[PDB]
Motif scaffolding. Structure first.
Motif: not given
Ligand SMILES: O=C(O)CNC(=O)C(=O)O
Ligand SMILES: [Mg+2]
Ligand code: NI
Ligand SMILES: [Zn+2]
Length: 331
Positions: A180-183, A232-233, A298-300, A302-312
């Motif tokens: 899907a469309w993303h960065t 889009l995230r 940008s950041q999500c 809302c809680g849906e995109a839920r990403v990695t340990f390293s992105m913290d």
């Protein structure tokens, strides 16, 4: 300014030029490649990722994803239904079945037509996001498991030492499997190598025009837009080239074949689909030019995109005001 029309550029490095990855990325940018959002790199003829693919069938796809679509042919969302584990050998057999195999077609354009006309009516299974690498450890050039890490880039540029690691991911695809469309997370670069199999078609919006795609997406997915300021995230929305053309959104398309690398650039929105059974490897990376994009990503929350340990850590250091609310979404 180089490449002012933001065309996707294709590069053919010599084996000599293939030694220094960072330098080659900086060269491509010197020629304007990043303005497209996406570039193709054809490796030197002497280079190989590994000697053969003959023994890959025992890799496990622990959570294959069935990509179920909703909407209309040109404007849809997809949800991922988790399936029971299967080996790559099992998955390849499935991809080659009458139910799932690539249809007869004339050329890539006819196949693209058939994908946009018919995608929504099927639910292909994607073996995505599998931690691992298919590069031989003896491959020294453009080995996606040996790249400089994003944490080390941030340390070199900004002086701050942070936790986290950066490892590649495998993608096993079949006909109609869809991204899907993303960065990228934190508007990082990505690099993607198509190890084997059938092609992958890409669509991309130039970074300088990314907000035009976001505004279209808010109009086309209005409940999603109200739910989250960066939906889009979630990596669920598809918009066809026909619809992008109807709405004046600048974009380009290109088909990647086995043996080729693609680079996506910071804040280059991309989407695409696989033509048949294939295996790709991809990883995020950074350069000094990325740092400002990371600060503005940008950041999500809302809680849906839920990403990695390293992105913290990236959020914590580059976006301290957001830190707080973004981690409420991730906890
Ligand atoms: O290959 C895919 O399914 C998705 N890949 C990417 O979005 C990438 O390499 O950035
Ligand atoms: Mg194996
Ligand atoms: Ni991507
Ligand atoms: Zn969200």
């Amino acid at each position: 300014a180089q490449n002012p029309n933001c065309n996707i550029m294709i590069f053919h490095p010599t084996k000599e030029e293939f030694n220094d990855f960072d330098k080659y990325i900086a060269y491509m940018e010197s020629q304007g490649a990043h303005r497209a959002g996406l570039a193709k790199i054809i490796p030197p003829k002497e280079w190989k990722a590994r000697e053969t693919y003959d023994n890959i069938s025992e890799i496990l796809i622990a959570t294959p994803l069935q990509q179920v679509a909703s909407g209309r042919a040109g404007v849809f969302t997809q949800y991922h239904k988790k399936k029971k584990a299967m080996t790559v050998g099992e998955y390849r057999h499935l991809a080659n079945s009458k139910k799932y195999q690539t249809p007869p077609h004339q050329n890539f354009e006819d196949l693209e037509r058939k994908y946009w006309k018919n995608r929504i009516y099927n639910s292909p299974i994607y073996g995505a996001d599998i931690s691992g690498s298919l590069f031989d450890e003896n491959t020294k050039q453009w080995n996606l498991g040996h790249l400089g890490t994003i944490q080390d880039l941030l340390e070199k540029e900004c002086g701050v030492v942070i936790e986290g690691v950066n490892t590649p991911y495998l993608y096993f695809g079949m006909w109609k499997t869809t991204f899907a469309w993303h960065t990228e997370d934190m508007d990082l670069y990505s690099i993607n190598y198509l190890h084997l199999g059938e092609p992958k078609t890409w669509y991309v919006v130039p970074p300088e025009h990314g907000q035009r795609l976001e505004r279209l997406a808010r109009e086309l997915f209005p409940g999603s837009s109200r739910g989250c300021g960066a939906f889009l995230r979630h990596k669920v929305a598809l918009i066809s080239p026909t619809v992008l053309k109807e709405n004046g959104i600048p974009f380009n398309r290109i088909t990647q074949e086995a043996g080729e690398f693609m680079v996506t650039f910071p804040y280059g929105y991309h989407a695409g689909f696989n033509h048949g059974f294939n295996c790709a490897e991809a990883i995020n990376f950074a350069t000094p030019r990325w740092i400002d994009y990371g600060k503005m990503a940008s950041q999500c929350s809302c809680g849906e995109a839920r990403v990695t340990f390293s992105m913290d850590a990236f959020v914590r250091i580059l976006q301290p005001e957001r830190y707080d609310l973004w981690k409420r979404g991730q906890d």
